[PDB]
Structure formats: C-alpha cells, structure tokens
Amino acid sequence: ETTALVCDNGSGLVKAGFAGDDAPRAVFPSIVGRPRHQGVMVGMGQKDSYVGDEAQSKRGILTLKYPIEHGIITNWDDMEKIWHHTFYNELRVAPEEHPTLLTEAPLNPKANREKMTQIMFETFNVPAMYVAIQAVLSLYASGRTTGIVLDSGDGVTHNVPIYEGYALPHAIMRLDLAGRDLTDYLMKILTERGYSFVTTAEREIVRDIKEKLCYVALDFENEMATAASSSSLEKSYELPDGQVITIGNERFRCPETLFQPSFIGMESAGIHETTYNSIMKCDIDIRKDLYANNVMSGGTTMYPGIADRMQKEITALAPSTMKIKIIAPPERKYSVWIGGSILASLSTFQQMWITKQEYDEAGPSIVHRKCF
Amino acid sequence: ETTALVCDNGSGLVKAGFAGDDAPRAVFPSIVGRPRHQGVMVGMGQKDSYVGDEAQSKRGILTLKYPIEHGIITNWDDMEKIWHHTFYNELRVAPEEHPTLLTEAPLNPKANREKMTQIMFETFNVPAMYVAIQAVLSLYASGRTTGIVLDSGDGVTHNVPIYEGYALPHAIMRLDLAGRDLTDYLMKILTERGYSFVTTAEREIVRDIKEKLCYVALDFENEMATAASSSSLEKSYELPDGQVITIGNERFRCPETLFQPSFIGMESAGIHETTYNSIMKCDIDIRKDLYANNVMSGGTTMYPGIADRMQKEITALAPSTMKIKIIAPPERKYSVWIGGSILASLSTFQQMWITKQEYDEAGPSIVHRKCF
Amino acid sequence: ETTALVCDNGSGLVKAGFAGDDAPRAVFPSIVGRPRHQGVMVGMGQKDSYVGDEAQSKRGILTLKYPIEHGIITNWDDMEKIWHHTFYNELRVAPEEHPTLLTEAPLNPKANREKMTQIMFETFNVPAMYVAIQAVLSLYASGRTTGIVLDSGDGVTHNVPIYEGYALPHAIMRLDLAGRDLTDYLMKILTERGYSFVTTAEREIVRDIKEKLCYVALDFENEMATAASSSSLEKSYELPDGQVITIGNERFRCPETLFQPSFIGMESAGIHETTYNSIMKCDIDIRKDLYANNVMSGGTTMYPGIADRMQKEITALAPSTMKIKIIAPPERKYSVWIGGSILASLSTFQQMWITKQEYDEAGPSIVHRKCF
Amino acid sequence: ETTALVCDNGSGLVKAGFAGDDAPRAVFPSIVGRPRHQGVMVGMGQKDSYVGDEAQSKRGILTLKYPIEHGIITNWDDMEKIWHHTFYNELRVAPEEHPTLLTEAPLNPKANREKMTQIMFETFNVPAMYVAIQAVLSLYASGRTTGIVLDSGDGVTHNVPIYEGYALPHAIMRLDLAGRDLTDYLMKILTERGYSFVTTAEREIVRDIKEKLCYVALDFENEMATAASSSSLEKSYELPDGQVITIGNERFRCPETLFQPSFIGMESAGIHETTYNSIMKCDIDIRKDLYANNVMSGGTTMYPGIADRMQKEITALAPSTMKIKIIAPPERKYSVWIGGSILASLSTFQQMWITKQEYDEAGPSIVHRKCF
C-alpha cells in the first residue's frame, strides 16, 4: 500500500488529504446548497446542488445547510455528497485503493459511527477504515502522551484528558457551545447596531466578521467600561456589497460566550470551568501533569487572547502552589488532521484497521469494540 | 398624579390614550405627507405637511411616507411631527404633567430607544417615561404570565416566550415580514388581473382591500384547486373612483406569505415554524405551558382563519401527545395598548419609571439597563 | 392704494374693470378694424383704425381682424391699440397708479406672457402686474377650491383639475375648438340654405345668430329625425338689412361640434371626453370630488341645454355608482373676471405682484417662475 | 424542422424574423389606421384599414391607434391584423410549418399571455410556441448570465435581476414610463414655443424629433443655466410640410423624465433609482456582480449620453468602494430579438416548446406553469 486517506469531517470544514503530508490538500466548508429561486437560463452549468467551495461562491442564490450539526450527522443524504465531492473532485482518488481515517467527537451517538462505517464500505468500498477521537489525535499531533485537550471547533467543545496514553472516559466533558453558536450570537447582537443579517447566506458574512474582528478580553468588565469611551475599540469591516459596518463592544462580547455561556441562555459552565471540572474528576496524582499540559485545538481557540485568559482564569480556580501552562500551537486549526496523518503512517497502527472482511461478518457492531 | 399616557407607536397606526381606559382615544395612521404638486390657491388652510387622518383624507395629492419602517424609526424629523400631532391635537394634553409609556419591538437597535428617550425629555419634557416591549404587554393584557406571544403587526413579527413572568431573551424570534410586506405583495399580484396600483396613495387602497377581502386558507393547495372553478371564491370591491375589481385566488394567496415567506423571496420560515423553533429553544420542562398558551396580537393576526391554520400546522410539528391552544382574543388589535394601560396604572410599577433627574446625570444609557 | 385693474383679455371680448366690483365696467369686442374703401369725404372724424364698439358699429366698411387667435396674441401692434382703448377710453384711468391683473390660458406659449409683461411695464408703466390662469380664477369665483373647470370661450377650450388649491398641470387638457370655430362651421352650414356670409363683417352677423338660435340637443340622432318634420324646430332671424332667414337643423348641429369635433375635421375628443380623460389622468383618490364639481365657464357654455348633455354623457363614461354634478352658474360669462376681482382685492395676494423693480433686474424671465 | 419564427411584439415596433439570423427581416410600427375622411374616389385600392408601414405613409388621412399600450394588448381585434400583416406580407410564410417565439414584459396580466396563446393556436395554427420575457432575452443576447437588465422600450421600463441564470422575481421593478410618455411630454413642452401638435399623425412627427434631437444632460441644472444663453443648444428640424422649428432646452428636458418622473406627474422613482432599489432588494452576496453588469436595452436607452448619466448617478447611490459598469451595446434596439434568435436556435430549448397537443388538453393554463 502506498498511502492512506485522512478525512476530518468537522462541522464547519472538511480537512482531507494523505498520510505523511503535513498539510491537508483539501479544505472546504461542509455546505450543500440548493437553489431557491426560479431559474430561467436552463443549462450552461446549472447543477441541482452545490457542495463546498462552489456553494460558497454562488451562496447568494442558495439555501446553505450544513449536514453536520453539533458533531452529529443529521443529513446522511447530503453527507454522502460531500464525501463524493471529497474523494472525486478535491483529491481525485478512487476509494477502493486507499484506507481512510475518519474522525468524530467523543460522547457521540452510536448511530453516527455505525453509518459512517456502513457508507464507507457499501458506497465507496474502502479496503479498511478507522474512526478516531478528535481530541486524542490533537494531543498526538503536539508530540505528547499526557495532557487535557480543549478541542473547540464549529460544532462541539470537548475536554478529553489523557495521561500517558490512557484515556479517562469518565472525565470527558462534552459541551455543545462552539463557533456556530458564537456566530448565531453575533448575528443577534449586530441587530442593536441596525445590521440585519437574516438568511443563511449572511451567516457566512457574520462568520467572516468573527474570524477577523473578534478577540478575547483579558478582563471583561474592565473592557466594557473602556468601550464606553467608544473610540479605540471600534474597527470597520468591508461587506461584499461595498457597505461598511462599525462594531465596537460586539468584538469581544461574543467570545465571552465561551467563558460565560449564560449569554445565549445555557445552564452550563464556561470552557475554563469545564476544563477545571474535568481535571478535578481525574485522580489526585495525575493532576500535576494535566494543569501543565493544556493543549488547545480547533478553530474556535484561534481568537487573539484566548490563551491568555485561559491561563488567567484556571489559575483563579487551581491552587496557587502550582503552574498552569496553556499550549496554543500556531497550527492548531489543523492539529486534528495532523495527528491523523501521523497515526495513519505509523507501522504499529497498520494492524488496527477495520477491514472489509471484519465488517461483513459482524455487521456495524465491530466499530464500537475497537475504540477506547 | 392622576393619569399617565400610553403611546403605542406602531409602524402602521398610533394608539394613544390614558392609563386606566379600556380603549385608546387616538387611533390614526403613522403618515406624514408632503404635497407633490403646484399649489396655485396659496392659502385657505394649506399646510406644509399633513399628519395622520388629515393626510389620509388628502392622500390623492400627497406623497405618503411612514417614519417607522420595520419597527425602526428612520425619519426622526417626521416622528416628532406625529408626536406633536398626538399629544396636542388628538389628546389635547401637555406632556409636562403626564408620564408617558412608549413601546417598541424586541431586538431593536439601541439608537432607536435612546432617541425616543432623548426627544421625550428634551422636546416634550415629560416628568418620567418607560419604554416597554410590545409582546410582553400583549400577554399581560390577556391576564397571563405564561405564554409565547405572536405579535405580528404592520412592521415586524416577533415571538417572545414568557414563563411565569420570566422572559427568555435567547428564544426571541424577530421576523421583519409583516402586514406591510403583505400589502406590497398584494400590489404585485393584482397586476396579473390588470389592476395597476403604483403610488403610495394606492398603497392604502390595496391595504383596505386586504383588511376586508383576505382570509387564510386551511389548506392552500386544495384552495388553489377550488379557485380553478373560479365562481365562489371571488368577491368585488368598491374603489373610491367608482370602479369595481374582482379578486379571486388573490384573496387567500397573500396571507399565505405569512406561512410561506418564499413568495416574497425570503429565506425564512413561516410564522408557524418560527413559533415552533422558538418553543424548541426554550427548556424542555416549560414547553408544556407554551404549547397551551399561544397568544396572538397585532393587526396582521386579524385574518379570518389565521388561528385555525396556526393550530392546524403547529400540531403537525409538535408531538401528538399534547394539546395546542391558539389564543385569539377579539380585541387583539389593541392588546399591546391594553396591556400598557394596565401596567401604567399599577402601584407596583410607579417606582419603575425613568424620571428626569435619572436621565440628565446618566445620559441615554439609563434606558438600556432598565428593560429585561 | 384704493383699487387695482382686472383686464381679462379674451379672444372675443375684453372684460375690464376694478377689483372689488361685481361686474366689469368695460365689455367690448377685441376688434381692430381698418377701412377698406376710398373715403372721399376726407375729414369729419374719420380715423385710421377703429377699436372695439366703434368698429362693431362701422363694420360694413371695415376689415375686422382679431389680434388674439386661439388664445395667442399674434398682432402685438394691434393688441396695444385695444389696451390703449381699454385704460384711456373705457375706464378713463392712468395705468401708472393702478396694478393690473391680466389673464391667459394654460399651455400657452412663453413669448405670449413675456410680451404682455414687457408692454405693461415699458409702454403703460404699471406699478405691478400678475398674469393668472383663466380656469383657476373661474373656480375661485364659484367659491370652490376643488373641481375640474371646463372653461370654453371664443378662442380655446381647456380643462384644469384643481384639488384643494393644488393644480395638477400634467392633467390639463387644451382644445383649440371654441366658439370661433362654431361660428365658422355655422357659416359653412348656412350655405346649404343659400345664405352667403363671406366677409368678416358677416362673421358677427352669424355670431349673433348663434348666440340666440342655437341649443344643444339632448340626443343628436333623435333630434335629426325630429327635424325631418321641419315645422317646430325652425326659427326666424332678422338680418340688419331687413331680410329674414329660416334655420332648421342648423340650430343644434353646430353646438354638436363641441361634442363631435369630427364635423370641422379635427381628430380630437369632445368636451365630454376631454373632461373624462382629464379626470382619469388625475390620481384615483381625488376623482370622487372631481366628478362632483364640474364648473363650466366662458361664453361657449351658455348654450341652452349644454349642462344637461354634459351630465348625460359623462355619466355614460363614468362608473354608474357615483354622481356627476355639472355646475353651470348664470353669471359664467364673467366668472373669469369675477374671480380676478376677488383675487386682486385679497390681502394674502398683495405680496404676490410682480413689481417694476423685480422686472428690470431679471428681465422677462421673472413671469414664468411665479405662475405654475 | 428548418427554422423558427421570433416575433417581438413591442409597443412601438414589431420585430420579426427567423431563428439564426442576426437581424430581423421585418421592422414596422404597431399601428393600425382607419380613414377618418369621406373617400370620394371609391376604388383604386382603398382598403378599410392600414397596418404598419402603409399606415405610416398614408398617416395624414388616418387615425393611428396602437393595440399594445404599456405592454398590454388592449385591442385584440387589431392585434390580429398586425400578426396577419407580419406572417403573410412581411415574412411571406405560413405559420403552420414554423414554431413561433413571442415575447412580453414581466408583471404582465395573465389574460394577455393566454390570448397570445389562444390566437396563435386557433387562428394561425402554429405547431408550437413559447412566450418569453423581454429583459431575460436581452441579457442572453449579450452573452451574459449575470446582470440586471434595464429594458426600456416604447410602453414599459422594467428591471430584471438575473444571477447566473436564476431570476429573482421578487426584485423585478416594472415602471410604466417609457418612450411613449416622453413623446407625449414633448408634445406638451413644444406648445410653449407655439408649436401645435395635436392629432395622432403629428404624434409620429414629434416622435421623429425625439429620435434625432434629444440627448441626456450629464447635469440637468447646469444645462438649464447653459441654455439661458440660447445659442449653442438649439438645433433645427425639418417638418414634412417644409416648416422649420427651433428647439432649445426642450432637447434635454424630455429625457430628464426618465430620471425625474415628477415632470409628467408620477409619484415614482427614476430609472436610476428603480435600478438601485432593485439591486438593494437582492441578496448582499450577488450585488457585487449586479453593479458590474448593468445591461441596457430597448430604444429608449438610445439617447446620446444616457449611459454616462446612468453611471454617474448610480455611483451617487452605490457605496463608493466599488465599480459601476453600464453596458450599452450599439445594437440594443434589437437585443430582445437577437436573444430570441439565439434561444430558438438552441438544441437544449427544442423540448421546451408548448406544442399543440399540450394546449388542447390543458387549455390556456399551460402557458403560466412554463415560465420562470
């Protein structure tokens, strides 16, 4: 065998490529868009649906919907369209020769992984596959075997702690607040500036505002008083129609939802308390190495200043006689994929695949007695 | 103090009166009309602008514009003219003795409420004021403290779920489709009968057609097939020039835009799905009392048969093991004003006003830390 | 200043007088006649030209020509002779002390009004002047501010719709068919009785036949069949030489040209259809008040039975569910002058004059940016 | 099948020809004239009605009337005479062998398209037909699939936004101001020079003045001040009798009605604001390509300098950080016909005709469910 496919199906983006590579060769959004309007010039390249980058380019006339919602595939008819887009148009490979490596979040429903396995063998006919946990791959991309991982993507935020290669599944804290809910809260608090974003095509306009104008304030209540003298905390954004918008305290107030989830109305804890509660559910001896290895991942942890407040606010919870080290790599948008590329190229992993002859004798129940 | 003023500045009409009354003493449209013509006979009572009922009578020579558009006051020079018409010519009171009660929609821009507060203290010099929420007052007029309120007026449609007096601001679904957009869609689909209504003076002719010839079909595709045998579903209307028109399927097809917003080209859900999506964003425990208390309000919910389809189509979305009760009072055109009259007469409310000495030291930012 | 002059320069007659008077003190025809014969007895008061009533008396030896043709002054050398006759011989006043009020028709050429202004300042030296519209003054004489005005004099027929003192200049219809063309058609259809009227002195003989023998038939095709038994519809007229003439169907057939302009070969509508087309070019809201106020004026509308057919035939065009009221005052030969006498005696009009110091700084272009 | 007929029934002209040709083989006005006079020499080829070019030659003795008025066929007895003139005298083909392609304006009455379909199958008996939209065919003639189309012809001005072959029918702005109303306004403002054009035979004399003496001023108020020194902005025209007329500011003041519709008394926006309001009703993502593709069409957009002011005045409304490209082809009088010739010659279109066996089973309601 030459290579192996590593397909990280996130809620927002699809990262895909080959094992051994240090960067995915296919990054495109998880969008399947149907045209909503009439259509008069029938022909000249009008498809029934648009997937990925072509749905992002033609997004004005399309109803964009994402098949993966909070890490759970709810649109299996359209998730097959993204995989059909992935292997045949973004990578130009046939899946019959390459073993694929899929990922998913922990504490996921069992019907999600059983149908990822069923489609990869019956539709695409892979030689073998494997479904890994995203937070465990992200720790392995950083060259560690010990550390609690804050993987926060577009659909889910989870907090898997790992000590010396042993997962502690009773301490995994799955939170369904991620970059999608911070986008939907930014759409809510831009209406108080008279900025109406309503359709799902302006959902990516507000998402692009969030990716280049939002930051995490070190102290939120002192930053709100600074924004009362609204001069220095205001930046302008260029809308695609040529309009400009001026946002002030809305820059730092939507990443505050990661730390105060009561803004979108969730009876829940912040990402700093669910990190602290996940350490305090582990054993007393291994906490010394978990406060020292706080690896962040995903795209939601790419805010300017999120690692500074993450250290500043766990230290307010942890006992002061020990150190807190937040690990923020610069490549952590792709660290779940990078850990998948190292894993699929290991020689000690080559006997841990789920082959075709193991699937048809035991059905879909083979995929649950393999992980953890 | 004897009485207080309750001014409901809707997008279409202005309701105004006194606290304790059961009906407003001043109902007139939110119209400021300028003359568009020459004016040869200079004098004999030709004013520069006509406001309210006098602009509705002289509407054939006036360009009618509304200062409130989708619940947002965009014409602050002309909104003061309606308030100058309201307190001085419709109520004949001086605002220096009476505390006023204004209303607005939720998820409104912050500059809208600040300039309502600034004009009511600097121009009219009220003793105290308070800006309430329209859907919360409509529930309080119905004698309830629990229920989701579909307040669809002339400018905006919005759902506010309230449970035991606690508002859930993360579940408020604001939708800018309302009775104005159903008037502009009825103007669009009367052109297929050869009926040309173009200027803003025929905008109230088409609006008057809508208020007495339109109904909500219980099943739309069966009603369109019934209207193919176009005999029983046609009624005639008397235009002011003596002409008669005959409208058929256009009677029930413009209130269908409330339930299918794709007719006017909005990627949005109907009023039945934004009600269902607003209940499903509330907590699982309180949904039992929200499906049972569906209070409707505003003038747009006054169609014949709108409560019957609202119950028929939430039931298709809600689980069948529980009951749906759409509450449609017969006085629900004024229910936002009625709840404002009960609120301004409460003795437990008299300490919740925003007085003049609270405004001049704290500026316009006092009015945002008072509501919700 | 005590008084002000009101000079209505019609095509047929000159009405002149003072403001405040209820009747003009000078009514004489717009005639300047030159002698066409030898004149052997040189002297004894033989003037070079005869103006007004003295030309109507000596008309047998004169070539009578009218300087105002279809409301347009084409003979400015001879229009000054009528004005010189008017101020100095019919009113016996000097124009240097009295501000004059001139009138003209709508949709008139700009060189007509600029030369009325130039002659009234550079020849007669009035203190101030104003050129008004004839049909707007006729509505103001009737005490109305709303109504479409069928003004039909000797030179032109024109409709002006006015609503609440606001003229609608896009809906002004102007029709050059008037009482002069009905005189020239009566001269044509008297030749089939062998009555030869050829020169311009018999033009006033036929005009005097028309003013006391012509009537408007209620139904024309039934009246033509009634005149087959040519006994009851014939009346005799006394020519100035002593001859008698007997006219039958020619009594009602020339006022039919007002309603059927194809008799004199004009591709045009009647006065009932140009009234209806001028209402239907107005806005649809004000049509209810325009069908109910049909003020007629001029001398051409003095036919017996013109108001009965005007109501009978607009009703055939207007929708039947509304009323048509033709307003035919008995003084409507002078209603253009009467409205000018009320206007020049107002106090709100005294600042709307065109004074001498406004004319010499802006030239003749001052007179267009004040009226319409 | 050899060819297909493309008959563009405009309000002013009839363009007809064959599919594949680059120019129509039949251009003649939509005029049916009846003789209004006696006709003493009975015989020698005096027909009862004259259609098209033969009515334009004999127009002095005819009452010319238009069956198509504001894009609505109101004279179905006389519209069949133009089609009978078209296939049998201008093209010399029998319609039983050729499938025809008709056009009409958007937001047209339903009875207009049904009677086009009924007459083409019952009277002329075509094999198949299709009724298209005029503005969509004009964009397709320019080789584009994306752009907003200002198709201003003789009866109607309408904007249609099209993005990549998907029409947005909620953003179509239809305006009933076109070249006929600019002709009727020019007849009105030539009367202030003393030029009396009244009958319908001088309606084409004034129309021929407009087609070769009228231009669009870049700035209107500076051009009116330039015309005060009335030397350089005056040109002469040769009337058919031999008279010459000198027009000054009336050259550029009637195409100003396209940009200021208040001159003819319409509460409406100009063609630059209805273009801008139609873009601002589209989605934010597609506006970048609609401001860059402003395709104009029709004969009314053939004024010298209309594309320069169209770019100058949308730029005053659009945000300044983007480009506005008005597309003005030199062949845009026939671009609605050219796009119909390309469409009827396609092979992907040959299954979209409305055949005879589809019409007789479903009646005239087939023609509405095969558009947009």
Ligand SMILES: Nc1ncnc2c1ncn2[C@@H]1O[C@H](COP(=O)(O)OP(=O)(O)O)[C@@H](O)[C@H]1O
């Ligand atoms: N550079 C950035 N800065 C801030 N936020 C970002 C950035 N890039 C992505 N995001 C947010 O993170 C989410 C993308 O995370 P992603 O890496 O796609 O996770 P997944 O692939 O698991 O969905 C998006 O919703 C986006 O809003």
Ligand SMILES: Nc1ncnc2c1ncn2[C@@H]1O[C@H](COP(=O)(O)OP(=O)(O)O)[C@@H](O)[C@H]1O
């Ligand atoms: N009796 C009625 N039946 C149906 N629709 C109505 C009726 N009265 C008003 N409407 C519609 O509702 C709107 C008025 O709602 P209104 O109570 O004035 O709300 P708001 O005061 O918040 O503007 C108008 O646009 C009108 O078209």
Ligand SMILES: Nc1ncnc2c1ncn2[C@@H]1O[C@H](COP(=O)(O)OP(=O)(O)O)[C@@H](O)[C@H]1O
């Ligand atoms: N009493 C009358 N009956 C019928 N026709 C009349 C009468 N008086 C005048 N006319 C006609 O009307 C015309 C005079 O109209 P007039 O009032 O002089 O208008 P103007 O002053 O604008 O010329 C004359 O041509 C005459 O033929």
Ligand SMILES: Nc1ncnc2c1ncn2[C@@H]1O[C@H](COP(=O)(O)OP(=O)(O)O)[C@@H](O)[C@H]1O
């Ligand atoms: N060369 C021209 N320059 C200016 N205006 C023109 C020209 N040709 C035609 N027009 C005006 O455009 C109108 C004709 O438009 P046309 O292309 O016939 O549209 P349609 O075929 O849809 O009626 C006429 O009313 C005429 O006044």
Ligand SMILES: *CC(=O)Nc1ccc2ccc3cccc4ccc1c2c34
């Ligand atoms: C289901 C699962 O957790 N798989 C998984 C994830 C990550 C990871 C990293 C490094 C590894 C080294 C050797 C073997 C395995 C096996 C499974 C595995 C990993 C590794």
Ligand SMILES: *CC(=O)Nc1ccc2ccc3cccc4ccc1c2c34
């Ligand atoms: C801003 C706001 O929502 N005000 C508001 C609305 C409605 C309402 C109803 C009943 C109440 C009883 C007691 C106190 C208050 C206070 C505010 C208020 C209400 C009431």
Ligand SMILES: *CC(=O)Nc1ccc2ccc3cccc4ccc1c2c34
């Ligand atoms: C040019 C013009 O139309 N002047 C005009 C005509 C008639 C009329 C009647 C009554 C008026 C009352 C007040 C002011 C004016 C001013 C001009 C005027 C009139 C009046």
Ligand SMILES: *CC(=O)Nc1ccc2ccc3cccc4ccc1c2c34
């Ligand atoms: C009803 C209608 O809009 N038909 C229409 C108009 C224009 C147009 C242009 C180009 C096309 C290409 C392929 C197919 C079709 C089909 C219908 C059609 C068009 C086209």
Ligand SMILES: [Mg+2]
């Ligand atoms: Mg991820």
Ligand SMILES: [Mg+2]
């Ligand atoms: Mg309201």
Ligand SMILES: [Mg+2]
């Ligand atoms: Mg007169």
Ligand SMILES: [Mg+2]
């Ligand atoms: Mg055309």
